[PDB]
Design an enzyme around this catalytic site. Structure first.
Site, PDB file in Angstrom:
ATOM      1  N   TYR A 171      -4.041 -12.295   3.788  1.00 47.19           N
ATOM      2  CA  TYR A 171      -3.502 -12.051   2.457  1.00 47.19           C
ATOM      3  C   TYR A 171      -2.361 -12.944   1.999  1.00 47.19           C
ATOM      4  O   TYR A 171      -2.558 -13.882   1.232  1.00 47.19           O
ATOM      5  CB  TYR A 171      -3.038 -10.595   2.353  1.00 47.19           C
ATOM      6  CG  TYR A 171      -4.140  -9.577   2.513  1.00 47.19           C
ATOM      7  CD1 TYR A 171      -5.106  -9.389   1.500  1.00 47.19           C
ATOM      8  CD2 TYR A 171      -4.257  -8.831   3.684  1.00 47.19           C
ATOM      9  CE1 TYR A 171      -6.160  -8.487   1.665  1.00 47.19           C
ATOM     10  CE2 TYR A 171      -5.295  -7.934   3.864  1.00 47.19           C
ATOM     11  CZ  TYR A 171      -6.254  -7.765   2.852  1.00 47.19           C
ATOM     12  OH  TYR A 171      -7.311  -6.906   3.062  1.00 47.19           O
ATOM     13  N   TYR A 188     -13.138 -13.974   2.666  1.00 44.46           N
ATOM     14  CA  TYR A 188     -12.129 -12.940   2.784  1.00 44.46           C
ATOM     15  C   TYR A 188     -11.925 -12.835   4.297  1.00 44.46           C
ATOM     16  O   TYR A 188     -12.883 -12.909   5.042  1.00 44.46           O
ATOM     17  CB  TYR A 188     -12.650 -11.582   2.285  1.00 44.46           C
ATOM     18  CG  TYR A 188     -11.817 -10.425   2.800  1.00 44.46           C
ATOM     19  CD1 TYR A 188     -10.514 -10.223   2.341  1.00 44.46           C
ATOM     20  CD2 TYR A 188     -12.299  -9.576   3.812  1.00 44.46           C
ATOM     21  CE1 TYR A 188      -9.700  -9.219   2.872  1.00 44.46           C
ATOM     22  CE2 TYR A 188     -11.485  -8.557   4.355  1.00 44.46           C
ATOM     23  CZ  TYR A 188     -10.189  -8.393   3.879  1.00 44.46           C
ATOM     24  OH  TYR A 188      -9.364  -7.426   4.418  1.00 44.46           O
ATOM     25  N   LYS A 204       0.813  -1.215   0.000  1.00 42.64           N
ATOM     26  CA  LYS A 204       0.000   0.000   0.000  1.00 42.64           C
ATOM     27  C   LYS A 204       0.850   1.271   0.000  1.00 42.64           C
ATOM     28  O   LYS A 204       0.497   2.271  -0.642  1.00 42.64           O
ATOM     29  CB  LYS A 204      -0.960   0.010   1.200  1.00 42.64           C
ATOM     30  CG  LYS A 204      -1.948  -1.187   1.252  1.00 42.64           C
ATOM     31  CD  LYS A 204      -2.868  -1.255   0.038  1.00 42.64           C
ATOM     32  CE  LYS A 204      -3.885  -2.388   0.195  1.00 42.64           C
ATOM     33  NZ  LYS A 204      -3.215  -3.701   0.073  1.00 42.64           N
TER      34      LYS A 204
HETATM   35  C1  LIG Z   1      -4.085  -4.836   0.367  1.00 39.55           C
HETATM   36  C2  LIG Z   1      -3.181  -6.064   0.525  1.00 39.55           C
HETATM   37  C3  LIG Z   1      -3.138  -7.108  -0.459  1.00 39.55           C
HETATM   38  C4  LIG Z   1      -3.962  -7.121  -1.753  1.00 39.55           C
HETATM   39  O1  LIG Z   1      -3.603  -5.968  -2.552  1.00 39.55           O
HETATM   40  P1  LIG Z   1      -4.651  -5.338  -3.606  1.00 39.55           P
HETATM   41  O2  LIG Z   1      -3.885  -4.308  -4.451  1.00 39.55           O
HETATM   42  O3  LIG Z   1      -5.761  -4.680  -2.865  1.00 39.55           O
HETATM   43  O4  LIG Z   1      -5.199  -6.457  -4.449  1.00 39.55           O
HETATM   44  C5  LIG Z   1      -2.268  -8.205  -0.229  1.00 39.55           C
HETATM   45  N1  LIG Z   1      -1.490  -8.278   0.887  1.00 39.55           N
HETATM   46  C6  LIG Z   1      -1.497  -7.313   1.840  1.00 39.55           C
HETATM   47  C7  LIG Z   1      -0.557  -7.512   3.067  1.00 39.55           C
HETATM   48  C8  LIG Z   1      -2.348  -6.156   1.701  1.00 39.55           C
HETATM   49  O5  LIG Z   1      -2.382  -5.135   2.655  1.00 39.55           O
END
Ligand SMILES: *Cc1c(COP(=O)(O)O)cnc(C)c1O
Ligand SMILES: *Cc1c(COP(=O)(O)O)cnc(C)c1O
Ligand SMILES: *Cc1c(COP(=O)(O)O)cnc(C)c1O
Ligand SMILES: *Cc1c(COP(=O)(O)O)cnc(C)c1O
Lengths: 329, 338, 331, 328
Positions: free
Chosen positions: A285, A259, A51
């Site tokens: 994630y 999710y 991010k």
């Molecule tokens: C937001 C995030 C993702 C997924 O990224 P996107 O661009 O929203 O698809 C994966 N891993 C982590 C640790 C995240 O914060």
């Protein structure tokens, strides 16, 4: 294409390192060479993560527009909002965060540890729950000028540039290394991370080598968002070609059950990766994309000899909201 | 001096970055220029931190001895044991950690979040004993080492904080050198360093490293033990042993070891209101987080020193952020509203 | 029948009170008169509950057999094991409890608050299955020189496990005598089954076995229904029921057990809040909240004949509320 | 004296039972006979406790006054506030609680389990920090608030409940055919022991009511018990003055602070729970239990004395000290 047209506000230590995962590779048979690119260690601003790479390209605009408040949104353990809170603090800007429980989960300390704990310490005004609009207006109505940062930075005109740059960086490091990676494994939920990579690698014909691993548990939708953002982004950087649906790869086998909830495979991949390489991943994630890559290598889905670059996007702090599951390892 | 004689196993990304704390420096009056050297961001191994800089010099020995297990010890939210656990996994070594509550504190999730949670995920054998057990008294440390052998393994013993170990102070002598090289790439010098001190080999290494250029008394230690006398003594002793180890052709004077005691309260592991305000101030001006046990205390020290004009105007102060942030998870109630 | 043939060890304060739930009754229209019999307030032994009424008839055998350790089992937030631990302490006996993770639930303090916290304070050896337990537990006792009295899950599938609640019907009759009327129905939460079993047998005596409306909380209706029916018949034999328990005598509404054992649904939560807010009587998200949800919906659907008098058996279980703190963080 | 002059609103099941603590008594030597009057089992309203006995004398006034909302205050794990919330719902009244951070204790679920959790489930408006503010807030809202001070103690009717307790004990000693020589009771806000002092002053045993301080501010607590006992003695027509000799408050077991147990507190809670199956908490009862056990152990009780321990309630607060009891 031309990414350099857009100003980048430095929020990272610089390019992120690539490390071999020799132990994990050997553990799985040594038939495939795994590597990890540490986006998770890219910044000193509350652990950073993907991010933050996205935000370097949004902040110049926020400043140019004279905004004095960063406003964003995410689930209770959103990594995005914590990174936004850290960037605001660092930039001297206020921060309003709209947090909704986006997960069917209810751990006792869910809203008090990990990501959200950091956001409150970083000075963000964390509002637990129209949600989004009310927040933005409230800032104006108070005399401020808010910069709107949609979930994960993804549905934002600039949210895709960060990872076009990732592809750039990777070519340069590939040159340094004297070789190129065959595939890139990356976790996808809101989409601008894989979309940026799709575009940046389109430039050298490896778009379809970016293996996305859905962690949304709503693949169709996610797949669509990546495709969309990618096309828009590819247009903004002047990609000499239009992005096709064939450019987008999103495996949906490892997102279950929902999710924000891990499956037994997710936990096993998190444990295996941690125990063979000392590299942690989370149950929301990265553990899911780690699970995917491990499973791929195991099913012989990668051709013998391939070089896979696992993109570790961050997320580790969320581990704290899942303490019971990990009580004994 | 000659640190290069001792082999160093890579556990970090390389030299750690220095960043200006411009906003905080300005907030305090702009009279002192604060910077932070990010030891907290030195590794991909479970957030790393200062302990990881120390381990780079111990691992070559563990490896030369053919050890297959790393054995260490620490309190429930010990940062050291978490780093030992990640380094072990990375090296393909087993890991046994002896732990006990070393703090008069009892949060509901203290033993299942933060550092200890990671050590378990990393695959360490986390032997956490019930209150009143007293590992340090029963010498559970040795029993763990014996049990490894007993089970056909060969343990490498790593004491609390890595400090009271023959190689424990080398990492931070390396720190002073690294700082010299960066001061050269930059074109200017740092006038002081602020470092949190508990078990001591971090500050000790710095003392030996900076004595080499006449700057030992410029390392301003901030006690986080709440047991200053013992800590100061431990730092001094470790410094002298390390000084001799690296061939520092000079004595370490009592005057070389500086340890402020004003910010340690009320006890090891417990923050005071100043600690909490320091954590918040630094977090809200720089986006840099610190913890209630260690760094928040040295951040509080540095802030207070600047506020009281204890630093000569125009001084460049290098705050060594040693890590520890994962421990915030065990103090959730205190930060429930920020 | 003759329950009196079987001794009873005093573990409760005595008959449990019946209280009218006027506010809730009125809140729901007022066509059905709701009451609650407070099994949840029956004892000074760590809050007691339905299981402690069951235990009054098992302890004499345990004492008779000269056992020195009570051994039982249940999920992490089991109410049964806590009562066993308290009863054991009160009787001067050791206690060993096998607790298994029976619910797909992960809460940070799930194994450290509520029921299980009390068991540990009460001195029980609380053994958490990893992550055969039962026989190792019993044998560990023998190996230690003791003699264990095995108490199965919920005290249900045991020869004496259905007696407690036969007496419950006996109590209700004596209270109806003073009340001058008889309840038209009884609502009880059912999982291991011997609570509703004793009630079915107890009320079969005066032809109301079919008036005992069990509410399933197991989410495994068929099995539970069978266990009740079976335990009922066996108990019927044990006391002297001058009649036979028919399949029509066992009522078990399966509409309120979702989604799974140990997990509340939105209706469960509403029910807990409604009842607590109109009567000041708390129920839990695992058991009582589900039976309460049942009764409210029943009344709301006009399933109870206007003017009916319904006796809600409150079996206890409130301390488990602590294991679901996030759900109730704002009420 | 005459307590009957004051109306009482039934919030309890009736007189509280007295139980022998044979196992514990035997464990400590057998020289002192210990009993427990279970105020902790007095009501169907969210576990009740001593505060509930108090509220029975205050509710009539609230009702007469036509009040529609009960407003009270207390620490985060306050028992009083949880009881007011329950009584409130039962009476069909609104409820506003001012919950303050009165303890130097840091626990992750301290404001989400136990007593306060129940107050929220019971529909009370739980405000975390103010007294005057909440009251006004109620009026301004169009409702009429009935003010209940901390612990129901410093209130004109706040001492009535436990005068009644001494009455009850007399009636039960009659049925038992013997009288208790002492009563052990935990004291913090004061009207519990105050009522007892007035109640037992009636038959010459005010000084046999042994209060154990759990406030860690014995001075103020002793003064509050004394003052409340005087006002209450007047209210009931006690034909005597309350003397300092009538107020016994042991200060030895309150440490280290209000809301924090010491090791003796914990040992006491374990011992009692393991010998009788009766639980006590680390803030209040565990401290009075600790006191009684120690007194016995020191021979401070004359051989043969019958001691009635008053268990005021408080067990739900155990959930806020989960870590301390993780291994028992
Ligand atoms: C937001 C995030 C993702 C997924 O990224 P996107 O661009 O929203 O698809 C994966 N891993 C982590 C640790 C995240 O914060
Ligand atoms: C160990 C540690 C310290 C103190 O270092 P010593 O070498 O033991 O004196 C400071 N901060 C953090 C985050 C630590 O883990
Ligand atoms: C055990 C229990 C039940 C169900 O009783 P069974 O005899 O097992 O059917 C209901 N409520 C509570 C509070 C219980 O502990
Ligand atoms: C309030 C309380 C006390 C002390 O009673 P006071 O009348 O305030 O002195 C003791 N124990 C418990 C469980 C309480 O809630």
């Amino acid at each position: 294409m031309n990414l350099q047209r857009f100003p980048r506000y430095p929020l990272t230590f610089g390019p992120t390192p690539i490390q071999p995962l020799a132990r994990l590779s050997k553990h799985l048979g040594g038939k495939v060479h795994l590597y990890a690119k540490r986006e998770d260690c890219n910044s000193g601003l509350a652990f950073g993560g993907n991010k933050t790479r996205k935000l370097e390209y949004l902040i110049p605009e926020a400043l140019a527009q004279g905004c004095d408040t960063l406003v964003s949104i995410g689930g209770i353990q959103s990594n995005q909002t914590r990174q936004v809170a850290a960037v605001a603090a660092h930039l001297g800007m206020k921060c309003v965060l709209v947090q909704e429980n986006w997960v069917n989960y209810s751990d006792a300390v869910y809203d008090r540890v990990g990501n959200i704990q950091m956001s409150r310490i970083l000075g963000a005004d964390v509002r637990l729950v129209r949600s989004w609009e009310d927040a933005l207006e409230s800032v104006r109505a108070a005399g401020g000028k808010p910069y709107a940062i949609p979930a994960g930075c993804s549905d934002h005109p600039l949210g895709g540039l960060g990872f076009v740059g990732f592809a750039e960086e990777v070519r340069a490091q590939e040159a340094e290394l004297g070789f190129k990676f065959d595939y890139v494994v990356v976790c996808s939920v809101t989409g601008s991370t894989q979309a940026g990579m799709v575009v940046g690698f389109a430039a050298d014909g490896r778009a379809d080598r970016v293996i996305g691993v859905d962690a949304s548990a709503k693949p169709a939708q996610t797949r669509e968002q990546i495709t969309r953002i990618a096309r828009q982004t590819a247009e903004k950087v002047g990609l000499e070609r239009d992005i096709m649906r064939a450019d987008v790869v999103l495996d949906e086998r490892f997102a279950g059950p929902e999710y924000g909830l891990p499956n037994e495979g997710t936990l096993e991949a998190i444990r295996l990766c941690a125990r063979t390489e000392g590299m942690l991943t989370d149950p929301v994630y990265e553990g899911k994309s780690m699970h995917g890559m491990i499973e791929m290598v195991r099913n012989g889905e990668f051709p013998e000899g391939s070089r896979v670059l696992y993109a570790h996007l961050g997320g580790v702090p969320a581990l704290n909201g899942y303490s019971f599951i990990f009580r004994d390892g």
